[PDB]
Write a protein that binds this ligand. Structure first.
Ligand code: RP5
Ligand code: RP5
Ligand code: RP5
Ligand code: RP5
Lengths: 160, 159, 160, 159, 160, 159, 160, 159
């Protein structure tokens, strides 16, 4: 019932990307919350969200942002929980600004960063699942089944 | 006098760069404070610094950071004062990470960004001076003199 | 009545970007002028515009250009006023040439640079407003209201 | 105690970087193993290491590589454990090749990627610690202390 | 009859690119097989494919992948045969991630890398043909004819 | 003799690079002047230099600058003479900023751009020589000799 | 009558870009030839074209190419004439491969390089005109008129 | 014996890199020649070298160049032999110019491209060896031994 993963993003425009994280957590039956938290437009909301996350029972935060993408890193500054960052693709620089803004954190405050775009959102959810599976045997079984099906679904040759 | 510019940086390792901003403000006799404020390692210190800057009488904030450089942008999130950002040169990516994480602010929260490195630190101080000069005539004259000396001192041929 | 901000750009093609600066100054009731000044095709026009800006009562110049983008920097060479630069997105290099051409000024002649594209134009106007607000209490109040409304308009969760 | 984190790297030349991960895990008293596993030069060693990691009791793998950096991704292909990737700074391209070859994993096989270089190695260890802390209360308290000391130790002004 | 070149790729999406290699081998009458082998989703399939390639009679492997593109390099780790790599164009980073992931192999395990995209696929097939032509005189003649026709087909001036 | 090529650069720090252009013109006995002209620090000096270049008898201008490198383009704005641009290697971005700010001129005002660094300075001088050689037969013969010696002097094997 | 500028390019696909050079030379009444010369597919044609250019009366060569763009540099290797290079925009890398392939010539063999794309083609023609104008007074007058009209045609403000 | 691989490079400055290809071919006892051939400074030497390579009995050409690196591609234009390209690390752009000017060959004339720098030179020699091994059984066995020793010699832990 109570959420164990928080998915956060700075804008509705980020949802086109972050929806892939939401869908995968739901597929794996991982209770979660999905919210908008804007690092620059709602910085006090961010501080409160991140600093209370652990006491609220969250175990992992998945944060997506694009451009000068500060949401994952500032989240990580305020929580001891693992924070996973999804670089959202930007218009001009194709997410390279997003990527460098998120992955290049200073020693002492980590953000586990995934690929630019939808792939990264899906993989943030899978990485969160991998973390939770360490201490949830039922989920561990669901995740192993999921990975096995992924492997079995790969064809032997292309449709030419 | 009470400071009217705050120079802030995330680490002692930024000082090699940000000292150029400090020196310039001193040269132009602009009262200022020079502090370490770490966006990631001291986020509550940052929130407090930025949100109280205006009531403390600061007029401009100069913020320097390298890598995933969030200090200028998060400062701007908490203050209506103009915030000027200095990308510090990072070891691997030579400040390109610094530059993009500072300049690419989405619309609604600006950071006026200067060049990577020492040039950017000097120019953040000069840009702060040009802002203050709009409503301080004595400083405006000192800034005019500074720019005039810069122009007049350029040699005509290389040695 | 008399303009206190000048918005300048090198071409009509730049207007698609710089119109966002114009609109925001108008929203905040900041008197301004909006002109075409081409660094390469009208260099004497630029010299005259920049060197007379202060005596004409301008307080801030917002300059946009793309490609080998020299308009903001050459403006700054000729005026003591703060100059803010907007990198206009270019076709091949997506504004990276614009950005580096504008932001990498030598020590001694500053240009306060904003994001590539529309975001940068909007933020140049907001930064200009922040500067003017230091010595205009009515504008300072309008700007604080504007920022507060921005913060209040952020939803708590995405439309899924 | 039996290791719960494996730190692996493709070469001795990566050790200058990955030693920072090793030191951090030691500081936090997290039992770990530190090994060379080369994706290209010892691919069967990699397959064996990754596929048996869970049954050996590992909880997290930290993998560092430079250049065409395939070690973290291929590790993740063979294990359901979380795999954290450290891009090692390469000579010519300063770790940009390392970074893109690690972080740009297609959907379905994740690698949580940290910064280029020593910062990334330290942060992979801290991220592993934060994962383990979710279900080890004594470690969680030591990690809290570590983060608190980091925050409290930041000076207020540069020297 | 029996294949002497293997063309492998990680996904059906790669076929839009790798089909150009397949077509050129067919044009030059080089027997080959075309398969899907996913480095990350079917890593045991890859190990088996690469380690048995020589004993199965393959002489050259052409491998295409995009993004964090590991298929060519991991193939090369498991075979003594020459491995040629085709960087498939990726959405955000335009194949620059593909290119660097493939070409920047450590000393000791080579991948001969071709251009991003369709050009690279065509050239991987031509390079494979060049290799086989060293010890197949009939193919050597076909390849020389092919190159000669290419040269003769270049017009002297553009259609204006 | 009166100069027919002007070599200009924004700073003494550019001289390490631009000296290669100066040396080449001297070697080919092309009368020239070598000057500092700063686009940002001495913009009126630049306008005057460029607008009077043709009437002073200059035929080609070689302009070198680093960073936000505006000197070649603004020179070309004020003269119909051919302007050749040398991107000087900058500290952080290794001349990539220099290169893009010089070469990406919009249509209507050209700058013929050479390689980043010393190679580009040498080649700007050679390109200027090849322009002058079109209407100076003695120089054309000296340039032929120079290119012939370059070709003939390449060794057949490394030492 | 006889051509004094040669415009060369490696493919018909380059014409979309190089046509802007052709049009400007025609506008300025500069006699020229426009040809296809492929560095990689017709290397002997290139050697012959470049090594005979001066004796044929050419004064400037404008060469365009994209990707691994070798046509301008190899032209310059074989002629003492000034060679101007136009980087043609490539699909994946947006002409950055074209640009670096052309501009980064070794000391001793120059190529005067212009902008990526149509702007560069137009400017190669203008630069060629500037060179020819040094020893053709009538053209010098036409070029000064052209530049003056360019300056006079810049509006004072945008259409908003 | 008569050479079956030609190693060519544009300058003595490339030798620091290309010596790694030479050493590897020597180690595997592959008869080869090692020469300077400059695409821009000696274009007729290049045309002659490439067009006669096959009739001279060469089987593979390894070509190294930096900057605007045209040597491998122009070699491939004149021969049907496989041409392998080594991007030499350039001073300013760290071989990114070298890499793009070699690898981005349009369809119809291939160059098999290796990594920037010494790794690429070593790997061009190994790739040439793997090509030759297809039809030389003694060499194939020596190459098997070489790869086996590489794999077996990787240490299990860092020192
Ligand atoms: O890890 P240290 O050296 O303290 O800081 C290195 C970089 O991390 C950033 O926060 C600072 O702005 C600095 O540029
Ligand atoms: O060639 P050596 O120095 O062994 O290794 C250099 C790089 O090759 C990669 O596999 C390693 O991760 C390292 O970063
Ligand atoms: O600040 P200094 O060292 O004078 O000049 C550094 C760079 O600033 C540019 O104007 C010059 O062309 C030079 O490349
Ligand atoms: O100017 P030098 O040092 O002779 O050569 C430097 C670069 O120019 C290229 O042709 C060579 O391949 C080398 O990488």
């Amino acid at each position: 019932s109570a959420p164990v993963v928080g998915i956060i993003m700075g804008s509705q425009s980020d949802w086109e990307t972050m929806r892939h994280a939401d869908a995968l957590l739901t597929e794996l039956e991982i209770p979660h919350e999905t919210l908008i938290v804007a690092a620059h437009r709602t910085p006090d909301r961010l501080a409160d969200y991140a600093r209370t996350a652990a006491e609220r029972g969250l175990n992992v935060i998945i944060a997506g942002a694009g451009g000068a993408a500060h949401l994952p890193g500032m989240c990580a500054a305020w929580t001891r929980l693992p924070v996973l960052g999804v670089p959202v693709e930007s218009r001009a620089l194709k997410g390279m600004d997003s990527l460098l803004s998120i992955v290049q954190m200073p020693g002492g405050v980590p953000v586990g960063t995934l690929a630019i775009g939808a792939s990264g959102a899906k993989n943030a959810a899978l990485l969160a699942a991998s973390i939770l599976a360490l201490y949830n045997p039922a989920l561990a079984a669901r995740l192993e089944t999921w990975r096995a099906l992924q492997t079995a679904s790969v064809p032997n040759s292309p449709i030419t």
